[PDB]
Design a protein around this ligand. Sequence first.
Ligand SMILES: C[C@@H]1CC[C@]2(OC1)O[C@@H]1[C@@H](O)[C@H]3[C@H]4CC[C@@H]5C[C@H](O[C@@H]6O[C@H](CO)[C@@H](O[C@@H]7O[C@@H](CO)[C@@H](O)[C@H](O[C@H]8OC[C@@H](O)[C@H](O)[C@@H]8O)[C@@H]7O[C@H]7O[C@@H](CO)[C@H](O)[C@@H](O[C@@H]8O[C@H](CO)[C@H](O)[C@@H](O)[C@@H]8O)[C@@H]7O)[C@H](O)[C@H]6O)[C@@H](O)C[C@]5(C)[C@H]4CC[C@@]3(C)[C@H]1[C@@H]2C
Ligand SMILES: *[C@@H]1O[C@H](CO)[C@@H](O)[C@H](O[C@@H]2O[C@H](CO)[C@@H](O)[C@H](O[C@@H]3O[C@H](CO[C@@H]4O[C@H](CO)[C@@H](O)[C@H](O)[C@@H]4O)[C@@H](O)[C@H](O[C@@H]4O[C@H](CO)[C@@H](O)[C@H](O)[C@@H]4O)[C@@H]3O)[C@H]2NC(C)=O)[C@H]1NC(C)=O
Ligand SMILES: CC(C)CCC[C@@H](C)[C@H]1CC[C@H]2[C@@H]3CC=C4C[C@@H](OC(=O)CCC(=O)O)CC[C@]4(C)[C@@H]3CC[C@]12C
Ligand SMILES: *[C@@H]1O[C@H](CO)[C@@H](O[C@@H]2O[C@H](CO)[C@@H](O)[C@H](O)[C@H]2NC(C)=O)[C@H](O)[C@H]1NC(C)=O
Ligand SMILES: *[C@@H]1O[C@H](CO)[C@@H](O[C@@H]2O[C@H](CO)[C@@H](O)[C@H](O)[C@H]2NC(C)=O)[C@H](O)[C@H]1NC(C)=O
Ligand SMILES: *[C@@H]1O[C@H](CO)[C@@H](O)[C@H](O)[C@H]1NC(C)=O
Ligand SMILES: *[C@@H]1O[C@H](CO)[C@@H](O)[C@H](O)[C@H]1NC(C)=O
Ligand SMILES: *[C@@H]1O[C@H](CO)[C@@H](O)[C@H](O)[C@H]1NC(C)=O
Length: 1278
Amino acid sequence: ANKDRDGSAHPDQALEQGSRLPARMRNIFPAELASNKKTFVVVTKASGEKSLWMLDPFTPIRRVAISTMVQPIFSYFIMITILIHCIFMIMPATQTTYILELVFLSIYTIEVVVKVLARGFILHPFAYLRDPWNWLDFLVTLIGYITLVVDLGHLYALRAFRVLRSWRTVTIVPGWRTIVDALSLSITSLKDLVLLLLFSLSVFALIGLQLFMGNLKHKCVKHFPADGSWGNFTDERWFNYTSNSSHWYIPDDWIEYPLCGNSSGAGMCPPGYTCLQGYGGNPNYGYTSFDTFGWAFLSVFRLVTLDYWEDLYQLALRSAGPWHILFFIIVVFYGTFCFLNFILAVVVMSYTHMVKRADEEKAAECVPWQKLQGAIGAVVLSPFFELFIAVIIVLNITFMALDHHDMNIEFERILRTGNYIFTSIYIVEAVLKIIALSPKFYFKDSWNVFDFIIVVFAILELGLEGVQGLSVFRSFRLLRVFRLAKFWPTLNNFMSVMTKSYGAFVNVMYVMFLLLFIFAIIGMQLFGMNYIDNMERFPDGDLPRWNFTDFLHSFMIVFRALCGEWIESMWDCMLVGDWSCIPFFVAVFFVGNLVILNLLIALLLNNYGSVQRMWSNIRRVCFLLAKNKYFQKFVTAVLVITSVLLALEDIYLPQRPVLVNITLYVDYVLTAFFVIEMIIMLFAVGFKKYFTSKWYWLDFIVVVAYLLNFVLMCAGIEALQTLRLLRVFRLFRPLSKVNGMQVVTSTLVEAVPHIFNVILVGIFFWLVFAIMGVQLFAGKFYKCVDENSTVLSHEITMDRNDCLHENYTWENSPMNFDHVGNAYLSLLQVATFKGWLQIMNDAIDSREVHKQPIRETNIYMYLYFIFFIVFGSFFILKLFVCILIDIFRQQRRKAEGLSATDSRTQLIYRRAVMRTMSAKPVKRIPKPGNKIQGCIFDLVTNQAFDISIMVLICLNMVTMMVEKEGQSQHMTEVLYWINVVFIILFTGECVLKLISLRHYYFTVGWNIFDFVVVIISIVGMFLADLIETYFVSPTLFRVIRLARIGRILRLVKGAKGIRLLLLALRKALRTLFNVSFLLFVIMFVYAVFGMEFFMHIRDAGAIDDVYNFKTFGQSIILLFQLATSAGWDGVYFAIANEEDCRAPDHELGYPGNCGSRALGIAYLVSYLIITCLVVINMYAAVILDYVLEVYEDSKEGLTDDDYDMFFEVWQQFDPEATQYIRYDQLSELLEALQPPLQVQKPNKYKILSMNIPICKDDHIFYKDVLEALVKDVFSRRG
Ligand SMILES: C[C@@H]1CC[C@]2(OC1)O[C@@H]1[C@@H](O)[C@H]3[C@H]4CC[C@@H]5C[C@H](O[C@@H]6O[C@H](CO)[C@@H](O[C@@H]7O[C@@H](CO)[C@@H](O)[C@H](O[C@H]8OC[C@@H](O)[C@H](O)[C@@H]8O)[C@@H]7O[C@H]7O[C@@H](CO)[C@H](O)[C@@H](O[C@@H]8O[C@H](CO)[C@H](O)[C@@H](O)[C@@H]8O)[C@@H]7O)[C@H](O)[C@H]6O)[C@@H](O)C[C@]5(C)[C@H]4CC[C@@]3(C)[C@H]1[C@@H]2C
Ligand SMILES: *[C@@H]1O[C@H](CO)[C@@H](O)[C@H](O[C@@H]2O[C@H](CO)[C@@H](O)[C@H](O[C@@H]3O[C@H](CO[C@@H]4O[C@H](CO)[C@@H](O)[C@H](O)[C@@H]4O)[C@@H](O)[C@H](O[C@@H]4O[C@H](CO)[C@@H](O)[C@H](O)[C@@H]4O)[C@@H]3O)[C@H]2NC(C)=O)[C@H]1NC(C)=O
Ligand SMILES: CC(C)CCC[C@@H](C)[C@H]1CC[C@H]2[C@@H]3CC=C4C[C@@H](OC(=O)CCC(=O)O)CC[C@]4(C)[C@@H]3CC[C@]12C
Ligand SMILES: *[C@@H]1O[C@H](CO)[C@@H](O[C@@H]2O[C@H](CO)[C@@H](O)[C@H](O)[C@H]2NC(C)=O)[C@H](O)[C@H]1NC(C)=O
Ligand SMILES: *[C@@H]1O[C@H](CO)[C@@H](O[C@@H]2O[C@H](CO)[C@@H](O)[C@H](O)[C@H]2NC(C)=O)[C@H](O)[C@H]1NC(C)=O
Ligand SMILES: *[C@@H]1O[C@H](CO)[C@@H](O)[C@H](O)[C@H]1NC(C)=O
Ligand SMILES: *[C@@H]1O[C@H](CO)[C@@H](O)[C@H](O)[C@H]1NC(C)=O
Ligand SMILES: *[C@@H]1O[C@H](CO)[C@@H](O)[C@H](O)[C@H]1NC(C)=O
């Protein structure tokens, strides 16, 4: 439609496009319309469409107006002034800077007056401004105006929103258009799933409001008033007593009250108190309870977004009882592992659709001197020397990464002389290679300059510390390590593929930093002041470590909200300002993580992807038995049933004295069974085809283990435990043959060799960061602490000597940077966002060795963790997902037939043509037997009845959103008697529909679901009499009624996008189930191996007599939490303690009570890889592969709807029985369909065109017509 404006409609005015001004006019003042400097613009082609048809350029001021409109320097002047304006904005206040702000305000007004006067009188300021840049540059300056003629008139909440001028600068760095519009399209498409997200959060909050209505208030109160002192009343004064807070139970120096509950297996708080309900107070200042709708919405959004959820988990389970985890699973599997990936799918799709246009457009275009020169040349490029220098730089990397903290003098001199030797050989062989060849081709390789640079640095480091320069170049000494890039092929490829496609990364990083800069300034101006005026509602009257007071702290808190954690800062904000802290943080999370970080993942994904007789007879008979189905079912069943029994080996096994005997008998018969079946199959398959096979080696290892364990009776030594648990692993062999677990195991076992390569590259980069973290922080982190765990401030203990003066102990903090090992550990803590606060605090405060740290100095050393986290967590750990998506796609394809040589486009046509086998039509039987009884259906099928019902659903869903704890007595009865009206109306309506069309009621799924739901409602309304004849317990009446919630999810019916996404989710369910199955078997293995190592532990950190490893149930209660790497710092600090232990005695009542450290490090770091990074991402891979396919099927091919909405015609366009037509109505049949499968009425020549085989005289079968239409629409669109 470009010719429309390139025509007599409303002509152009002028253009520049690089040094030529061809003006367009009213055609009666023609000048420069050719298309000598201009006919080269043709050559330049071999832009400002002004749209000013309002009035005339008659050489008024409008001339110079246009002349300055498009100009090389105007926009540049504006942009430089914006940059300097914001860099003044960064510093809070200054006297008389006010008048400067007046200049910076009045530049923009001349900028807008010229840009407007050059474009009309008033009329087109109504038509053409639809480009939003002008909207921005207009609204913000009008805000600047209104702020200046009110004189601080109690409105400082909008003087901040001027900073979003600076977005205008995103267009200064090249290659910026193919990213911005990507965000635009992603938002414009993400709307559709926003709707479903909203509805689903709502129904989950409604479910949670029923099960947990006001039990997070439970407290522990002393038994009775007393027998004595408090009096004699034992009546209403009782209520005066049990409300005086000062005898609720707080252990010591806490500020939260522990929760009790009195179900089975939770709380039971002291002996001497009792667990009372409903005495004021909620955890976290009163922002957590489920006791009304809004707070339930907040907590369920907190669960879905997967942020600091271990707190709510532990609270809810402490209160109600462990079975309640059957709730959390449902909101995690559906909301976080299966819904927050619809967003990833949408963003990836939009980005890969916007990159294609751009890239296709780009792709559419002394003589012995030289004698010994040859000699040394022979002795330089010889392959000896590359080997030699590679080995020497490896030994250099080794000698530059020891650096203990104390480091005895021998290490000192050793490392010194080593550095000397290494710099010497570097310099000498570099210079002799200089004199070996090419005194000037040398600087012509773009790779040897690096060596000269590092040599210069080594030399100057040798010098200026030989003089009194303190820390001159030992930092740049690190740069050796990157020289190890000529030798690895993997690392060389990883480097090249980024170094020669790099505009995208720069642009994305710039957008990211600019966005959170904008947010930081808005914050510093908006909340700001409230942290100093009030300043005392906090616990101990002092600014928390994270606050909006200076620019730096503000930047940091918005960054911390971007990386994933946004809730623990919302409480503080909302504690000093009543509201307007919720939209801010929810927005900075939503346009933060979920959009930009998903855009980054969408960018690493298209750049990095005679007795012999009976000898033979026995062989034959074992061969015959070994393959019978029943024997295989038997062995599988015996494995499963002897494995499940391995669970109930918990604490107080001895107190059940019969179990020990039965389990010993079981393991005896087990070792017999194993050794027998090995003989059987060993005669069966044959020797040499039994050791080279992978699976059978598992059986060999387990049988040799059971053998070595059995013979340990002649020695009388008791059977060692860790061997008799190797039984679990055989459980992996049958698992691999469930119908639909070929894809998952095949893709894992093919993905492994890439996982390992990425692990290696990550090890390398983290080494580069750690051997610097050591020299920056090693030796600090010490602190002087009293008998308690508190730090003497600054003057009671200035440095170490004073700390040892009066016996104040001199403690160390656990996570520190002494070795290189602890560096890896603490960095793995920083880069998974768990327990990364104490490290940053102690790293901020480190002043200098042997001296007490000050509360906040050395603050600029945040920049270490930011540059580490951008290059170690948004870039590497997000690369594991980008190798399971590709591999899963390839494996599904190559495992469902469908040969892999068809180029991604004819597969759509294939699925379309394949869809044409389930095409049976049908007709509704019209009308019942006699008139009035049948006169009911005549309207039940109408556009104003189901719509007249789908409002009752919404009204009912509102009347369930009012309940709250503390309802006055009258309210509950009116709600009760208002439910019955609906519960009878629904069944009345359903029975009318059913008695209308007498039979045939069950040909649709929705009718079946409605019938089931309504009978469930009508029986649940009665069974609400759970009182007076059955156990009167809250946690059963509170669940039996949930049935009423079923009749509201009927609301999703009818919307087409909210049906397309659900079709996508349903088309991939067996595979998703199988992935969850594998995750649970892994959790079972780890639970069993845990119940043995970590059963007796000293309570510390995060092990609180309800979340220990003692029994099986609590073991899974803990491991389901650790599966998402939520709170592993506490569990690690608890199981890896090795101080005061009371080591076992092996003499009487054998205790444990300390654990260890080796298999503490080796038990978690191998559970944050098998689970947190390799399976939880397979969820995303599967659902992304299915959603992307259903979209690209809808937008181009034929959707699942088109066929049945085609069938609507021919459903009530011909009768039921015969599937035939006689060629006449056929014609205007193509006038009763819809644009996808139809052509307009001039079709008789096309009906002549297509060859639909006329069958019997005048019967036309349908598949012919429909196939013709399918290939016709594929011909028209393509
Ligand atoms: C491939 C990788 C990628 C990642 C990346 O690496 C490569 O890794 C690097 C990361 O790790 C980053 C940082 C590391 C290197 C830089 C370190 C630099 O430290 C500076 O220097 C001091 C650290 O030694 C600190 O300030 C000192 O604080 C005390 C020491 O603990 C004082 O003792 C001292 O004063 C002077 O003592 C004598 C001299 O020998 C010293 O030279 C020093 O100058 C200074 O104090 C000064 O600094 C402030 C805080 O102390 C106060 O304003 C004030 O201090 C007080 O004033 C008194 C007199 O004035 C006296 O000093 C002292 O008693 C008082 O405390 C004073 O002005 C403070 O850290 C800062 O100054 C800091 O800035 C961050 C930095 C730039 C960052 C730039 C480079 C990175 C981003 C990263 C780099 C891309
Ligand atoms: C298990 O968890 C339950 C829910 O989570 C929880 O209800 C239950 O807590 C307590 O269990 C004990 C059982 O030992 C039970 O006694 C407690 O309830 C009693 O409530 C009485 C109500 O008195 C009211 O007083 C107000 C004053 O305004 C009045 O208006 C009311 O009409 C009502 O009378 C208390 O009076 C009572 O105190 C006792 O009352 C006895 C009767 O006279 C008397 O003989 C005693 O000496 C004493 O005076 C109890 O508080 C129950 N808590 C509540 C809130 O009901 C918990 N149980 C266990 C075992 O864990
Ligand atoms: C996902 C599918 C394919 C696997 C089916 C089993 C699982 C869903 C797991 C995870 C949640 C588990 C349940 C959570 C609740 C309970 C009760 C609890 O066990 C107790 O000891 C309860 C205490 C008591 O009531 O005496 C902890 C484990 C257990 C048995 C369950 C163990 C097995 C479950 C059903
Ligand atoms: C328990 O009863 C006592 C007296 O019956 C209450 O003490 C009174 O508390 C009010 C609170 O404002 C004071 O104004 C009165 O002066 C107090 N009485 C006397 C005699 O001084 C006590 O408040 C009751 N318990 C609770 C929790 O309110
Ligand atoms: C909660 O109990 C404490 C302890 O009895 C009460 O403290 C008493 O306060 C009154 C005056 O306020 C004194 O006369 C008593 O001597 C105090 N008791 C003791 C043991 O010293 C406290 O007042 C109670 N809470 C409320 C709200 O009254
Ligand atoms: C408590 O009240 C009862 C009510 O009759 C009274 O008999 C009793 O003496 C009172 N308690 C004391 C210690 O006097
Ligand atoms: C630890 O704190 C307590 C207060 O809870 C106080 O007795 C003292 O400061 C410390 N205790 C001891 C025994 O020193
Ligand atoms: C602190 O103790 C060290 C011990 O080596 C000593 O050398 C130093 O002089 C002492 N300084 C002060 C101020 O006590």
